[PDB]
Amino acid sequence: YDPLAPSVIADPYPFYRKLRETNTVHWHEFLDSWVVTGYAECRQVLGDTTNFGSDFRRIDVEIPDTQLSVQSLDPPEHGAIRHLLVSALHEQPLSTVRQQFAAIAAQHLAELSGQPGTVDLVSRFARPVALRTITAFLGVPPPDGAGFEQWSNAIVRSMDAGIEPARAEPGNQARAELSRLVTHWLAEADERGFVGAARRAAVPAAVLANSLRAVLHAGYASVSRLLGGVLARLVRHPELLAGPATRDADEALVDELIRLDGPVQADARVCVRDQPVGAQLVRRGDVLVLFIAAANRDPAVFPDPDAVRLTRRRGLHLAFGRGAHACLGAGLATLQLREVLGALRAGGLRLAPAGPAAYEPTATLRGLAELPVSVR
Numbered sequence: 001y002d003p004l005a006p007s008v009i010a011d012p013y014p015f016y017r018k019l020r021e022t023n024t025v026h027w028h029e030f031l032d033s034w035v036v037t038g039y040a041e042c043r044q045v046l047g048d049t050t051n052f053g054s055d056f057r058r059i060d061v062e063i064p065d066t067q068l069s070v071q072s073l074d075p076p077e078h079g080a081i082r083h084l085l086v087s088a089l090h091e092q093p094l095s096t097v098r099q100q101f102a103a104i105a106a107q108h109l110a111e112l113s114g115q116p117g118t119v120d121l122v123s124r125f126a127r128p129v130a131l132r133t134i135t136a137f138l139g140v141p142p143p144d145g146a147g148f149e150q151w152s153n154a155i156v157r158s159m160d161a162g163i164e165p166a167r168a169e170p171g172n173q174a175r176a177e178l179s180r181l182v183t184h185w186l187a188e189a190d191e192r193g194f195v196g197a198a199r200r201a202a203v204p205a206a207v208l209a210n211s212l213r214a215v216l217h218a219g220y221a222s223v224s225r226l227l228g229g230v231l232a233r234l235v236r237h238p239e240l241l242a243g244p245a246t247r248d249a250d251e252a253l254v255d256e257l258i259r260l261d262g263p264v265q266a267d268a269r270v271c272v273r274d275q276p277v278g279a280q281l282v283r284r285g286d287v288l289v290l291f292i293a294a295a296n297r298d299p300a301v302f303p304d305p306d307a308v309r310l311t312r313r314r315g316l317h318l319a320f321g322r323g324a325h326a327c328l329g330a331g332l333a334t335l336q337l338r339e340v341l342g343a344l345r346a347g348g349l350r351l352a353p354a355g356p357a358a359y360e361p362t363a364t365l366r367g368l369a370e371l372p373v374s375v376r
């Protein structure tokens with residue numbers, strides 16, 4: 001199982017299933033990590049911050065204070081910055097946020113109307129919508145789209161540095177570049193928007209800046225890839241949009257689309273205290289990679305796991321994580337995807353495949369390089 005093999009990148013889910021069917025907790029000796037593909041096992045590890053952690057300092061690893069961030073802190077320190085970010089999130093009026101998200105999606109869809117040739121929905125919709133959406137929420141001017149994607153691409157590829165260590169350095173350079181952008185916004189941001197509210201709430205300055213950088217990039221990188229993957233499914237299966245289109249029906253549809261096309265394929269933890277996971281005893285110091293995308297296809301929990309089923313129980317999928325580190329933006333992301341579905345229906349356009357979906361060579365975060373379609 002080479003996670004970056006071209007055949008795996010083309011469609012990793014049959015490989016996930018082969019792993020899950022043989023052992024829900026495999027030891028990957030070359031990555032020196034457990035590979036967890038079972039739903040119960042991923043859900044266990046994600047919620048148990050007592051025995052499994054994200055702060056490597058809890059296994060005696062030196063981490064400078066300048067590099068601490070919400071995603072690499074565990075309780076009790078995690079609660080302060082986490083609460084700060086949630087407070088700033090909850091100060092944003094949702095009527096304004098939904099109007100902004102709906103306008104952005106509609107504007108970029110209308111720009112596709114009348115395109116006689118082939119259009120790439122990744123670069124023409126998923127990425128610009130995600131970038132304007134996150135910066136609108138943050139209350140800051142959008143950076144150059146092509147330039148920002150170059151930085152983000154380097155960062156996303158660096159998440160696979162455990163597989164290809166050469167990917168680390170381009171990511172460090174892109175991270176430092178996003179740091180300067182966040183520093184400018186902190187000094188200059190309007191009182192309106194998430195940045196202004198975070199600043200007021202504030203926690204050491206380095207934790208705040210690093211956490212805002214995570215909000216920015218986690219938002220852009222995840223939303224753009226979620227939209228790309230959802231769009232790829234909709235173009236092949238337009239019947240998914242021909243449903244009741246009520247608020248409750250769309251709630252179920254959106255939940256399934258996130259379960260199936262949630263872009264996070266791998267979510268890592270370190271074992272702080274020995275604990276059984278699946279059939280295995282995991283040991284303090286062991287790294288675990290939770291294949292949460294694979295867990296979301298576990299047939300024990302999601303019968304007909306590769307299909308949209310509109311009658312499943314809500315609150316099951318792990319695409320937003322679970323527990324203390326559950327996605328800060330899960331509500332924003334679901335709201336945003338809901339508005340995209342509404343914009344597609346109101347646009348009336350017919351998007352037909354004009355070539356194969358092509359995927360980037362990224363294993364931790366799954367993303368399309370291109371989604372060629374015909375606007376109609």
Ligand code: HEM
Binds near residue numbers: 226263320321329333
């Ligand atoms: C506006 C959109 C988004 C924002 C602002 C955002 C931001 C964040 C932040 C700051 C965290 C860290 C929370 C913490 O460590 O306490 C996080 C976690 C996470 N996000 Fe999001 N995110 C967004 C969208 C998404 C989407 C669309 C997905 C996948 C469908 C996703 C998947 C995840 C997951 C799985 C985690 C958990 C990581 C872990 O277990 O440590 N996010 N997000």
